[PDB]
Design a protein around this ligand. Structure first.
Ligand SMILES: CC(=O)NC(=O)N[C@@H]1O[C@H](CO)[C@@H](O)[C@H](O)[C@H]1O
Ligand SMILES: CC(=O)NC(=O)N[C@@H]1O[C@H](CO)[C@@H](O)[C@H](O)[C@H]1O
Ligand SMILES: *Cc1c(COP(=O)(O)O)cnc(C)c1O
Ligand SMILES: *Cc1c(COP(=O)(O)O)cnc(C)c1O
Lengths: 805, 805
């Protein structure tokens, strides 16, 4: 069937009986009234049973050996589905496939019933998910800590070409993977005031909200390790009658919904509450566990990784506990804090940086504000001693920003209180040291590091592309699944006629599979022989879905100009959600559907060009589209995409990449060789040069006839007959206030696209270049990334040793 | 030793005795007083003896079979040396090498004594030479007809960094290859007047100049065919006494010297006389030979190819003879003329086009002017009938140009009187139909053809690069020498570790060989490990040696900026002659030497960068430098280099190419694959777009810091301390009247150059790309070119059959 494990006689028999047992006792159903959803749950509970034993002994193992614990704090964990992933990591896939087959059921059908755990917005949230997988696979005593949102990222509906949002009620039918632990509920304090008495300050008259944890198992790849992801849920304490009970839903709103902002900051009180909620509950858990195992050894037994500044309050909260509750002297407490905390930055765009108004912190967390002021005072004294007389440096590095309203720069807070600060791609980390954090780098160079992102090869290859994983294993074995660098061995098969044919065959199969799904759940048909040109990621101006749109319109205009001229057929697919309040992003989605409305119904175009907007892009959809892609669009303006991870997913799955020298694209091209990548556009240096001179879009419009035609088509209502000026905001933006210079890369982009079409016409050479990419994608495994965090930041050695059964 | 033929016992013995025989009887010398020059001549006469038998029987063969004869008229035949070429084509090289070795002589030393037959300026003249070789190799009854200049292209001396010209007295020691044929002397008429009497017009009261032919053998490659190149020499007829005899050197001045203008037109009377002289004498020879074999069959037995418009007078001269002397009716004569004549265009630059003032033709060739007017009248009547009312078309297509001084457009004359008109590269031929000759193409589309240039693989591979020819023959045999397409078979050795090593070894050997020669005859040393970056061709603004200079200065400035940074070492070599009256070209030569003066003596640069100007570039020097080159510079502004041929020479000899999509570069990249070529810059379409908008160099100067620095260095006297404003004319030109937009391609050029340096750092991959180029250079053999002329223009079939011993 495939290398999805063995389908043993004893195991298939056992799975079948436990399946029927759960269907009866757990679901309380009989085969006469059971529906597909019932079958999915019976299967889920059956697979879940297999990891409880390992989950219990893994945790017992950590208690006995007492290794250093790694705590990954994040407000997002974009997990997706967990049924297939669990079967994969437990080598249970073929057995379950056979067992369900014998029961007369199609396992693939049941898998589609599971709801995605969409507790994330995009890249940052997915990274945390891949990291959890790699830490377990590498045998690290790691814990993921976050919030159990009852509503994750909204489900996207497209109506009249516009994005409509609807609540993601993912818990409606229940979650078989989590285990509520009400017995470990902890109190979290808000508001109140600070009292300064004899020995120490006291935080009193606070409002209390309970934090109830739900644990979810995180299985390592075939090593019998099962780590834990603990998500906190808000509960009101039990201490007009009716109204008082109804108002409990004021405290519980803290864990109600995920804020849908990808790369953007909203200073809302509810978001601040969520951030402190996760931090306060998590730190009590960490300390409790530690006291079990003098806080001098705290950093030797504890490491906390801050995923962006969202959990930055961990720094002053740790100080508060050590100083106020444990009564350690400030200097001692600060030493411990810095040594246990590390911070990861994910973007350089100013609007994404968290800068909380002082009046908010003052009211919600009065003690933390005082602690932050003290940290700032002591930090600035160090700066002053290192750079005497440099008064502007003092104001630039302050954690407190003056102006209209005073704010606290959480990024500055994180750098000051962490022993390590890292970017997520080489070019990004360099940019941090040369620009945004230049002053900090000059003060403490040793703190700055790079940790290039990666993706887990389990979910992003074995799970979503079994056909490719199989033809690869046929040649080099299965060891690469947990040691991706072994993919390089495929380089010796680049001239192998058999391999070339198999690689091309799996891609065609994936495309047919996806082309079918498209008609199944969406209905509209597409041509499987065309080049699948896809750009899937959150909608943002910096990602430039608009540059993609300009190319699509260029292709359409060229066809209309010379209809009987041959052009490589293409299906361009664009998908991604827009933040609810991001007007421009919503206009871009409308533009895409509008283009499709014209292009997809033009008789002259035929099946040579199709424009489709992939609705509700999420983890489960990514697993379907990526394995089917031919061309991966990674065209952000140089210097804006910190790393990107979708780019790695495409590379590992046999798609060629067209992109700018931005984020990880640079290292990907470096690994595969620039001749095997379609690079175009301005480099970071070119962008800076243009800014020095002053970007004037008009220049491009005046010197490029094809570009002018497109703008006039948009302006005149060619793509919006009933509403002639529908896209006036888009044109105005491109022409007068385009922060990402779409026009500047237009010419080189279309030129580059012609080169990809030329290579696609030569199937054999296209595939050989593909093999060159897959063979060199090893560096982008999150196992490599985590091994570097472990050795260079956390001070722990990864292990590939199977746990005692 | 190598595949330079067999060194048979009988043959070596025979060669030795004939060598001593000539040294004694021919040179009248003894081994005690003989010098190296004497030995060269003894060897030359010995090899010459071997082709006389074949020369006599080849001509007898043509007389007996009476095939259609091909007459290639050219005012230039850039032959170079003929000793080694003769040995190669006769398979006598190893035998002569052994024979001279036994006599205690070094044949290579003797070969260097021979004077180049530099009867050409550059590309057009060398093409005629390669064509003669291919026509003989293909068994065509072909005759090259030209002028025996007693002084060829001037010898170039560099003094104080400036070009100095000195007479090329190539006949000083005699020419052993030619055979004077005073018995076949023919009369040529000049001046006079036209008398219209009873039956026909008569050209009377003319001045007579005798045309004395000298025949030179043209051996085919190992097929025993020996064709003839007949060059005419001017002689005064024998009919104050002293002064009258001394004035004979007025008529004989016609064949005294080659006009040194490459791509430029000077309306000098002496040049016009040379053009008619070659045409008049040649046509009498052709007709005489024909009458031996009703002029209705004339086109079936005769084909005359016009190399550019230089011999364009052949059209009205043929009409004059047929109408005035043979008394054929005009229409009949015109039919014959058009059917036997074909014209090849070599450039689209307006200043190169021949437009003779009517007053000159009126005085020198009164009858021809009348004939030209009549041709024009009848031609315009045809245009008027095809495009009624299009009066501007009439004036655009006229052979007579009105204005300040009336002139005759010789190109229009050629198109009207030829049944075929061809460009010399696909892009060039297309440009002719879309621009310069658009009106003519619309009137007679069937006349326009393309015949992409080529080079002879005998002189340009076997002769100049025996080491490479040998390692190639080792794998695929020697058949490729006369069937270059077989080189494709080398594609299956691109991964062969042995071949890769041998290809790289021959290149290193060629470079050491050249590096030595450089110190031997010029003294100044160079680093053999560096990348040999060479640009050799006549000096002209359109070829852009200046863009090369800008890159060199950029490299030097970058080194000075970061001295301890590593950069791939390079030796950039630039060579070529400038027309004596072309001021800008002479300033460019001075700039190059000036750059070297600074760069080559900068301690900080060391041996990382050297700039050398190759003095007296000519055919013999090309045979030395090309096999030693790593990088071939073919950077003309798109649309200006009709074809180029030096580019083909480099490709065949293992050098990678950096160039624009111009001339044959386009087809070369097409044959090898664009990934194996270093293409950069504007395409023809981009150039046109810039001209529409208006080229403003200032823009580039303002937006490119590195470019600005260079211009300021040139302007301030950085490269000319004693003469601060020495290069003011160059800067003024670049900044205000640059017809070839050097600045427009600067950025992309330097970027491309960085990519070549990157590949050079990886010896193995550099060599594999080289193999890819050599393997696909087959299309550029002049045998392919001539086979197309034969079948598509001359109506004759080429033959590879050995002539009966
Ligand atoms: C706040 C923020 O930057 N959100 C976010 O999703 N950032 C994303 O994080 C990913 C993982 O590091 C990176 O690959 C992306 O480049 C970055 O935009
Ligand atoms: C008059 C003239 O164009 N001279 C000349 O040398 N032209 C040259 O002829 C060569 C052979 O066709 C071409 O390869 C060159 O591109 C062209 O410049
Ligand atoms: C991988 C992934 C992302 C990140 O994509 P980028 O192109 O790096 O922004 C976002 N959303 C989902 C569902 C993903 O799987
Ligand atoms: C081949 C050759 C040329 C022509 O070179 P291009 O670069 O095509 O102009 C000119 N001069 C000599 C001596 C040549 O051998």
């Amino acid at each position: 069937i495939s290398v999805r494990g063995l389908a043993g006689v004893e195991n298939v028999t056992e799975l079948k009986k436990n399946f029927n047992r759960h269907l009866h006792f757990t679901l309380v159903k009989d085969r006469n009234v059971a529906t597909p959803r019932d079958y999915y749950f019976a299967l889920a509970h059956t697979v879940r049973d297999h990891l409880v034993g390992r989950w219990i002994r893994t945790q017992q193992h950590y208690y006995e050996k007492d290794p250093k614990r790694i705590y990954y704090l994040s407000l997002e964990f974009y997990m997706g589905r967990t049924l297939q992933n669990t079967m994969v990591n437990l080598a249970l896939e073929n057995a379950c496939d056979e067992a369900t087959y014998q029961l007369g059921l199609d396992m693939e059908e049941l898998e589609e019933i599971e709801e995605d755990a969409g507790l994330g917005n995009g890249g940052l949230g997915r990274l945390a998910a891949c990291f959890l997988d790699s830490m377990a696979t590498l045998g690290l005593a790691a814990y993921g800590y976050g919030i159990r949102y009852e509503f994750g990222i909204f489900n996207q509906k497209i109506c009249g070409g516009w994005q409509m949002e609807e609540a993601d009620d993912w818990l409606r039918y229940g979650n078989p993977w989590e285990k509520a632990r009400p017995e470990f509920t902890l109190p979290v304090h808000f508001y109140g005031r600070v009292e300064h008495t004899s020995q120490g300050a006291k935080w009193v008259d606070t409002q209390v909200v309970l934090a109830m944890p739900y644990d979810t198992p995180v299985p390592g790849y075939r090593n019998n390790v099962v780590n834990t992801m603990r998500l906190w849920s808000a509960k009101a304490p039990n201490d007009g009658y009716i109204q008082a009970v109804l108002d409990r839903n004021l405290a519980e709103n803290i864990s109600r919904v995920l804020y849908p902002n990808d790369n953007f900051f909203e200073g809302k009180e509810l978001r601040l509450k969520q951030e402190y909620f996760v931090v306060a509950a998590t730190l009590q858990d960490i300390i409790r566990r530690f006291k079990s195992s003098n806080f001098d050894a705290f950093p030797d037994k504890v490491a906390i990784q801050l995923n962006d500044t969202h959990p930055s309050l961990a720094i002053p909260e740790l100080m508060r506990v050590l100083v106020d509750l444990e009564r350690l002297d400030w200097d001692k407490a600060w030493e411990v804090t810095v040594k246990t905390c590390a911070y990861t930055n994910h973007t350089v765009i100013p609007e994404a940086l968290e800068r909380w108004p002082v009046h908010l912190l003052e009211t919600l967390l009065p003690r933390h504000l005082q602690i932050i002021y003290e940290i700032n005072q002591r930090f600035l004294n160090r700066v002053a001693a290192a750079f005497p007389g440099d008064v502007d440096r003092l104001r630039r590095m302050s954690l407190v920003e003056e102006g209209a309203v005073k704010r606290i720069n959480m990024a500055h807070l994180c750098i000051a209180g962490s022993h390590a600060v890292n970017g997520v791609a080489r070019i990004h980390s360099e940019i941090l040291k040369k620009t945004i954090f230049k002053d900090f780098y000059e003060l403490e160079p040793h703190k700055f590091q790079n940790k290039t992102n990666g993706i887990t090869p389990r979910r992003w290859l074995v799970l979503c592309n079994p056909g490719l994983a199989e033809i690869i294993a046929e040649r080099i074995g299965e060891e690469y699944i947990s040691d991706l660098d072994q993919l390089r061995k495929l380089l010796s098969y680049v001239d192998d006629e058999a391999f070339i044919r198999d690689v091309a065959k799996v891609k065609q199969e994936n495309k047919l599979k996806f082309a079918a799904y498209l008609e199944r759940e969406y209905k509209v048909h597409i041509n499987p022989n065309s080049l699948f040109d896809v750009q899937v990621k959150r909608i943002h101006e910096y990602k430039r879905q608009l540059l993609n749109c300009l190319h699509v319109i260029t292709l359409y205009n060229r066809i209309k100009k010379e209809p009987n001229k041959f052009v490589v057929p293409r299906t361009v697919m664009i998908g991604g959600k827009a933040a609810p309040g991001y007007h421009m992003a919503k206009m871009i989605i409308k533009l895409i559907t509008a283009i499709g409305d014209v292009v997809n119904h033009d008789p002259v175009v035929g099946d040579r060009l199709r424009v489709i907007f992939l609705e509700n892009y999420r983890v489960s959809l990514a697993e379907k589209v990526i394995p089917a892609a031919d061309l991966s669009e990674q065209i952000s303006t140089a210097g804006t995409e910190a790393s990107g991870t979708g780019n790695m997913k495409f590379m590992l799955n046999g798609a060629l990449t067209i992109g700018t020298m931005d984020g990880a694209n640079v290292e990907m091209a470096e690994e595969a060789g620039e001749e095997n990548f379609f690079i175009f556009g301005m480099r970071v240096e070119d962008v800076d040069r243009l800014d020095q001179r002053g970007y004037n879009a008009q220049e491009y419009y005046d010197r490029i006839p094809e570009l002018r035609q497109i703008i006039e088509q948009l302006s005149s209502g060619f793509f919006s007959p009933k509403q002639p000026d529908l896209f006036k905001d888009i044109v105005n933006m491109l022409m007068h206030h385009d922060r990402f210079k779409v026009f500047a890369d237009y010419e080189e982009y279309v030129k580059c696209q012609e080169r990809v079409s030329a290579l696609y016409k030569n199937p054999r050479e296209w595939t050989r270049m593909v093999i060159r990419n897959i063979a060199t994608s090893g560096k982008f495994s999150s196992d490599r990334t985590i091994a570097q965090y472990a050795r260079e930041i956390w001070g722990v050695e990864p292990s590939r040793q199977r746990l005692p059964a």
